[PDB]
Design a binder for this molecule. Sequence first.
Ligand SMILES: Cc1nn(-c2ccnc(Nc3ccc4c(c3)c(Cl)nn4C)n2)cc1CN1CC(O)C1
Length: 258
Amino acid sequence: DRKLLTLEDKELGSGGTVKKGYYQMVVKTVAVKILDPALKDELLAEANVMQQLDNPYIVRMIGICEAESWMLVMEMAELGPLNKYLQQNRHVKDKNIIELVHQVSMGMKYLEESNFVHRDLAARNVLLVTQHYAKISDFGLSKALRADENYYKAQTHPVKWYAPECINYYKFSSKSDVWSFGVLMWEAFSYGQKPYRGMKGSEVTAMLEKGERMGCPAGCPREMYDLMNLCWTYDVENRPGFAAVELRLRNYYYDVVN
Ligand SMILES: Cc1nn(-c2ccnc(Nc3ccc4c(c3)c(Cl)nn4C)n2)cc1CN1CC(O)C1
C-alpha cells in the first residue's frame, strides 16, 4: 500500500534507481528497487523467487509496490554492497572476511537445497547488514530448477563470473554458482578489487581454457585461495557443490577463531 511507504529524493546507487525508504508495518527501514512491457514481468519474477526463500543470509523482501513507478521493497541492509565497503575499509581482518564468505556459502547452500540457481553471484550482489553480517541479494536472474534436472538452460545471452559451461553451453547449475562464488571469494580478499582487471570477457574465456586462473590476493589465507581454485574446477562434475564448499569454510573458520 504505497502511501504507507516513504522515500528519499536521492539514490543509494544507480544503473534504474535504488532508494532507501521506510515502510509503516513500528516503521521498518527498507530498500526499494525502482524500475516496454517486459520489465514488469522480470521485476515480478525477481520478486516471486525472493518470496519463496527464507534464510538469515538472504535478503528478505517485503513485497511489490504499484504506484508512480514499479517498485520492489526489501528488508534493508544499511551497510550496502560488500565490494564498495571493503574497498573503503582496508582495515578489515581476513578472519572477518572468512566469516562473511562462510555466510554467503551458507546462504548459497540453502539456495542449492531449495534447487534455485542464483546466476549473478558476485561481490556487488552481497550486502552487509553489519560488518559481521552478510546477505546475498539480486535474484533478478535466478531460476527455480525443474524437479528432474540439475541445471537451467538459456537462449542467447556478466561473463567474468560465469563458469565455462555457462559460456559454451548456456547451462546454469548450483555448480556454476560455485564458480561465481569463487570469483566472489577472490573479490573479497582483494578488498573489493574487480576480477580479471583490464581484460575483455573473451580474453578471460581464452585464459580459462588455457588452464589459467587469477593469482592469490595479498594477505589471503592459502586455504581460502585453494578453495577459490577448487571452485574454479573446469569440469562441472569434479567442481564441488555448495554443501562441500560450506563444509570446508566452516571447518576452516573454527580453527582460525581462537
Ligand atoms: C535488489 C537490491 N536490493 N538491495 C538492497 C536490499 C537491502 N539493503 C540494501 N542496501 C543498499 C542497497 C544498495 C545500495 C546501497 C545500500 C548502497 Cl550504499 N548502494 N547501493 C546500490 N539494498 C539493493 C539492490 C540493488 N543493488 C544492485 C546490487 O549492488 C544490489
